[PDB]
């Protein structure tokens, strides 16, 4: 039947009529602003997820784990929970004080009783009792999030009884689809799609992709036999401790079977330990003469085997090139090209510098006049009128003034870019160093072209990705060596 | 793409609505979503702004030109500045609704300035997020921009 | 606004699970009714909060009251006799006071009723009292579209919906009506609650499996942010006032404030407070590429409708349905439901007297419908039904109409199936042959061949009559494929 929960019974931290009282007695009180991956692990602990845990563990418990593995009662426990914060309002605090812990809003979760407090590297531990008033604030998919005491709830109401869980930290496609089934079929058990999901709307916005890809494909999945819900959490860092873990929180949502993809005996042993059997996930091979994925050790002997990395995976992706039918599901695929386009669809930036001897503007309007000849993409100029007008109409020349200009400047094309758009800019940057920030920015979340026009201070680009060497260029001839640029570095559609 | 700008007074949990309302329209996907409102319009758009009268009106119509480019290129971007003049309330609109989808809310939960015409007026008393972040999903569906 | 409170004020529930045990044991050793299915959607309706203040079946003087000043003993507004009947003898010598066990129609129990009235009405018996109810009639289909009214409350507040026009649908939803929602629900500024009616049982009335189909089928072109599909388990009830005005209150207790169907119930509806809006003449309006009520289209612009009946006529006949009618989806799932004659089963019956031509009329005509695939031909006729259905049967007057019966239950399953099933059984009696051609012209086609060429009893209305009597085999055959032909019931590649 329904494997139970872990210590043999379900944590809640959350009590109602406390939630009154104590959202009052937080007024008065010290308070700690969580980042969002502490917050996760709040939520966890706050939620049962970590059953029979009941507040973060002290300095001293920290580390009898990463030697017993236990906790006081010599239960068995893999991984240190903890709470922590790079505050240096946290310096001063003490044991038995209690801390009011709210989101990166100010937002009341629950105080937290101090048992221990010490710092390490740069970040502050704190160890004690929860009590808590409110979870997280998630407007976000509030169908699909539930607590361990929400899902097994609904597995009671499905009948169901035997589970398997996949705790997916990246999309996946039709290898781990098939083998998530026969794994089923062979288990006779049903299927939790349980994907991480922890981050925040403005640091961790990855998330979203990461659910939307499996609401693509979740259609393709027997209804009477499959689940799909979102575990708050980041993925962890792989390690048996880690895994470990997961089994953990897996039993305490209702799962006695977890996928993993390793299993070193060891610990495949204290798992079967807790009564959750991992199951390890093989190198999949795509099978032509038996038109299905097998695990390749089970592939007939001399079959043309198939196979995809995830390497080539994401280069053909980039460049257009084409997916086997076999891969993935049209849906997943079309998914993840809204969420990635490809470069000749992507967003890009051309960021012109060099010194003013050059016609870096002259550049850039004439480049903007033969990039609007495309259109699908809309191109922004931001260089004379428009950058004073909004940008930087109250700025000086100081060093650190026109170093916030040229970073306003890298800002604003940023958001340009990563909504699809091109942005064209040649602001004044002498300085490798903020040159090397922009550049990052906007790389992160598109594509970026310097051009290096080379006919207080200043410092060379060293490694453009055009350098106009010439002597007695025209415009015309410049601009059209910057489109076969774009073309060869796959920009152009 | 269109831009989502709350106004208000500052006692209003404009802030808290605005980033409910971003996580809500994230989970739609196809268009991106870019919340102008704390930590990242400080940073990057006004750090060297006094509280003027024209620095806080230069305040507003940098971030009212930052939302319209996200606009132009369909993206959807979610705004919650101070500011209480129709004058430049009037402007930022028109920047954005030139090049998209412009939607007021206001949330009436030195001087000030009542906004005469918004899409939505959250006039409520006791309203929590949830119920206040889908009555404005109810304005962006019934105005035609959720798909 | 906010939420719509119960009506009365607050959420009757007639199930206390602290006293489930107790009243699971009570039972036994009581005397005890078993429902029918649509007292049962009653009960449940009841034991529910549907019918909130409610808290058991009405007495023959609060019935007699309701039909007058439309109160209860409160005078609160009442529109409608909530009361249990049930067509058992068993009812005849039970009194007021007794508790009363009530189940389901596999003696599964439900609730026992504490008797304050006991009368009766013509054929059926009707019964008064408190209610306690231990289990809701057992549903394992649709588990997660079923709502309680506190579950769906509950639901519209996670969801942070507060205004909600509901649709309590009785039949299959096409573009008009789902066009008409979109703009009731952006007009009032509400979210839509998809409401079908859903009352029927596995046998007695499986037709709501069909109805949520197509449901199902159409809900992807809904907003999903403002819209929720739940089921409402009753029968749909028959058109009136009250009755209007009763469903609106079980519209409130679910949580909807406005509810599409007057207008002095208008009056009294608003009065409870749920603002009901009528359903106009919906047209397609060309000029416009989309439906708008008749009274709001342009004035000498194209309008364009469908009949039901005319609908329906397509459907059965292969024709085309417009494209501004319904979904394709909509479509294909009606098609699996009701196929076109060409595509659903018919059994052929032959009738006459012995009637050996008969028999090989009926072989020869298995062999020619068996050219043609798609559907399976079953020739119930000699060995056949000997060997498994008739081997034990006298010749009694009710032996024979005994095995006649049974051809036609047989035959019925194969043509509600989709096959064809050919028949040539002795019948002399027309009441017979007309139960027969009943029970299965209700789940497929009939076609009665009288072949002419105790006391016999010629068919009054046979299909197809062979009179002329120097026929060929072949030639009769081929004038029974024309009768098919032109029934339409024949199709091909």
Redesign the interface.
């Known amino acids: 039947q329904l494997i139970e929960p872990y210590g043999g019974t379900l944590v809640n931290l959350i009590d109602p009529e406390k939630r009154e009282a104590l959202k009052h007695e937080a007024l008065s009180l010290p308070s700690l602003d969580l980042d969002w991956q502490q917050q996760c692990e709040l939520e966890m602990l706050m939620t049962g997820a970590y059953s029979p845990l009941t507040g973060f563990m002290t300095r001293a418990q920290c580390a009898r784990v990463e030697s017993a593995q236990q906790l006081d009662d010599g239960s068995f426990w893999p991984s240190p929970i903890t709470l922590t914060s790079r505050d240096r309002a946290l310096a001063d605090r003490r044991p038995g004080e209690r801390l009011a812990l709210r989101d990166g809003?100010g937002?009341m979760l629950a105080i937290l009783t101090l048992s221990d407090v010490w710092k390490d590297g740069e970040r502050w531990h704190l160890a004690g009792e929860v009590e808590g008033a409110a979870l997280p604030?998630?407007?976000?998919?509030?169908s699909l999030r539930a607590t361990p005491a929400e899902l097994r709830a609904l597995f009671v109401?499905?009948g169901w009884r035997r589970i398997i869980a996949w705790q997916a930290r990246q999309p996946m496609h039709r290898a781990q689809y098939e083998f998530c089934l026969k794994s089923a079929i062979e288990n006779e058990a049903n299927l939790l799609l349980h994907p991480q999901v922890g981050g925040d709307?403005?640091e961790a916005?990855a998330y979203?992709?990461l659910?939307?890809s499996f609401l693509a494909i979740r259609d393709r999945f027997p209804a009477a036999t499959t689940q799909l819900s979102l575990l708050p959490a980041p993925p962890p860092e792989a390690s048996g401790r880690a895994l470990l873990l997961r089994a953990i929180v897996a039993r305490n949502f209702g799962c006695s079977l977890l996928i993993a993809g390793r299993v070193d005996p060891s610990v495949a042993e204290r798992a079967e330990k807790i009564g959750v059997r991992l199951i390890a996930y093989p190198r999949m091979v795509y099978v032509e003469d038996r038109a299905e994925h097998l695990p390749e050790a089970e592939a007939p002997q001399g079959a043309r085997l198939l196979t995809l990395s995830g390497e080539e995976f994401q280069r053909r992706m980039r460049a257009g090139l084409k997916i086997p039918e076999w891969y993935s599901f049209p849906e997943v695929l079309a998914?993840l090209h809204?969420?990635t386009p490809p470069r000749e669809r992507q967003?890009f930036t051309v960021f012109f510098t060099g010194l003013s001897g050059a016609g870096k503007s002259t550049l850039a309007r004439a480049l903007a006049a033969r990039l609007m000849e495309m259109g699908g993409r809309?191109v922004?100029l931001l260089d004379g009128d428009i950058v004073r007008r909004?940008?930087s109409?109250?700025?000086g020349f100081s060093k650190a003034?026109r170093d916030?200009n040229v970073?306003?400047i890298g800002?604003?094309a940023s958001?340009?870019t990563?909504?699809?758009?091109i942005a064209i800019c040649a602001p004044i940057a002498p300085y490798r160093q903020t040159r090397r920030d922009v550049r990052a920015m906007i790389e992160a979340v598109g594509g970026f072209v310097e051009i290096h026009v080379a006919t207080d201070p200043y410092e060379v680009p060293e490694t453009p990705e055009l350098a106009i060497d010439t002597t007695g260029l025209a415009i015309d001839e410049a601009v059209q060596q910057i489109l076969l640029k774009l073309e060869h570095e796959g920009y152009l559609r």
Do not use: A, M, W
Not at 137 to 142: A, E, G, I, T, W
């Open positions: 809003e937002y604030p998630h407007p976000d998919f509030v109401r499905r709307i403005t916005p979203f992709g659910v939307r998914e809204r969420q967003g809309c922004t909004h940008l109409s109250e700025l003034h916030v970073r306003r800002f604003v958001e340009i990563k909504n699809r758009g």
